[PDB]
């Protein structure tokens, strides 16, 4: 019946292993590919589906996977995958930061202000904005672009003993500053309006110290913030288009800069 001899069973294992490892490094840290909702079995299955197309037309750098060469090659593969995935984490980190800063001004998580102890953050609004960012990412086929960029990394720098240049790593770590910048640029209107509202509440406190932030400000501030976020949504679509595009350009430049200095 079904026949599976030794050579086929092994060659398949050894040949696929390195692109498999790079792809899994990308998947295990990635915008949507790295989610605890996705089980690890699906995580490995998608990786080996990608390896099914990566392996053909790829140099056969088949070294034993129980030696120090295996450790060194695995290090480079994990470095490449982690670099790509965590660099693309920046857009969603930025939108989460913007949402949580909007929420803190609204007063959603005031326990964080008074004491760091306890997991009483629950940035619900940040979660909603992160959902919207992920759905826009899906509609823009960002994961497809990530897969294509990973294929390009396979092509430009093959599986080998050449060390990866570290100037690119420092450049993309330095690019980590985009989180707070984009968090402000996304949240300027609501932040300014809520600051003006809080100053108005302080002016009301002026004439009557009996007026308190707990008594009056929090309900009104929360209502105004909810209305503003309902009104701020249409701004999200072009902002996400710019945000993903700039990060994709940055990743392309960094990948093009990696292999010159091996």
């Amino acid at each position: 019946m079904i026949q599976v001899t030794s050579e086929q069973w092994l060659y398949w294992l050894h040949l696929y292993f390195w692109p498999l490892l790079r792809v899994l490094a990308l998947i295990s840290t990635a915008p949507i590919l790295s989610e605890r909702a996705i089980p690890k079995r699906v995580k490995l299955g998608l990786g080996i589906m990608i390896t099914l197309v990566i392996a053909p037309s790829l140099p056969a750098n088949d070294t034993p996977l129980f030696s120090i060469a295996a450790l060194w090659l695995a290090m480079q593969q994990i470095l490449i995958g982690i670099a790509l995935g965590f660099t693309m984490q920046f857009a969603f980190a930025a939108v989460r930061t913007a949402g949580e800063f909007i929420g803190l001004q609204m007063g959603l998580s005031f326990a964080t202000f008074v004491d760091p102890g306890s997991h009483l953050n629950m940035p619900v609004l940040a979660r909603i904005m992160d959902m919207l960012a992920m759905l826009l990412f899906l509609t823009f086929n960002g994961h497809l672009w990530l897969i294509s960029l990973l294929v390009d990394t396979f092509h430009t720098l093959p599986i080998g003993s050449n060390p990866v240049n570290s100037n690119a790593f420092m450049a993309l770590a330095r690019a980590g500053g985009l989180i707070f910048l984009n968090g402000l640029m996304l949240a300027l209107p609501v932040i300014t309006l809520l600051l003006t509202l809080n100053l108005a509440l302080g002016l009301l406190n002026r004439m009557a110290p009996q007026l308190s932030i707990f008594v009056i400000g929090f309900p009104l501030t929360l209502t105004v913030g909810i209305m503003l976020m309902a009104a701020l949504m249409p701004l999200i679509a072009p902002f996400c288009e710019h945000l993903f595009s700039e990060i994709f350009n940055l990743l392309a430049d960094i990948v093009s800069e990696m292999p010159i200095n091996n």
């Binding site: 069973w9 998608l46 629950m122």
Partner: protein, 208 residues
């Protein structure tokens, strides 16, 4: 003598195989949607991964039953009693799977994988090999599963935000909104009997 350990290692490796068959079935979308729902309830691992995996397997068996029957009548029954070759029975076991994949696979994924596979122009859909159709199908299933999960994921965060705002407006800054939102989320999910609607929506949207 080491061959008897090599065969045991081969069996151990083969135990990892059924991931491929689950990719070929509805598992990859259903399990992701259910994990997103688990995250939605604000109570991670409230149904253990074993329970979620088993119910996903049952849903896939319900959905993939006609495909399994076609494979049975086309591939398994002429090969169980050795009436047909394995190399061509494997081909017979993919054509229903081919038609099943092509219905749920988006054009963008297929175009991307054709571009990155260095393949030539194709005259017919049947000419599309498995090596290119499978990853595109898995990616499309990932995308649609996340879309379904996020569409269902809204009302629970709406409840979370509403309850957090009300509690904060009541001055209850130290009360954690999750512990009050979970009973209300379950109350809504039972009132709109969301299990039945979720099962039906998954089944119908995956049939279509």
């Amino acid at each position: 003598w080491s061959l008897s350990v090599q065969t045991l290692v081969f069996i151990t490796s083969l135990t990892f195989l059924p991931a491929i068959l689950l990719m070929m079935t509805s598992f990859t979308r259903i399990i992701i949607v259910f994990g997103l729902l688990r995250n939605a309830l604000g109570t991670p691992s409230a149904p253990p991964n074993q329970v979620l995996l088993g119910l996903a397997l049952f849903l896939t068996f319900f959905i993939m039953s006609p495909v399994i029957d076609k494979i049975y009548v086309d591939a398994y029954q002429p090969f169980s009693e050795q009436k047909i070759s394995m190399q061509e029975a494997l081909d017979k076991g993919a054509q229903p799977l081919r038609a099943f994949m092509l219905r749920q696979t988006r054009e963008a994924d297929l175009a991307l994988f054709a571009r990155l596979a260095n393949s030539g122009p194709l005259q017919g859909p049947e000419a599309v090999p498995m090596r290119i159709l499978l990853p595109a199908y898995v990616t499309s299933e990932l995308k649609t599963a996340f879309q379904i999960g996020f569409t269902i994921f809204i009302p629970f965060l709406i409840i979370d935000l509403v309850i957090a705002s009300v509690l904060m407006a009541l001055g209850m800054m130290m009360v954690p909104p999750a512990t009050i939102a979970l009973p209300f989320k379950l109350m809504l999910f039972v009132l709109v009997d969301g299990w039945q609607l979720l099962m039906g929506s998954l089944a119908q949207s995956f049939y279509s």
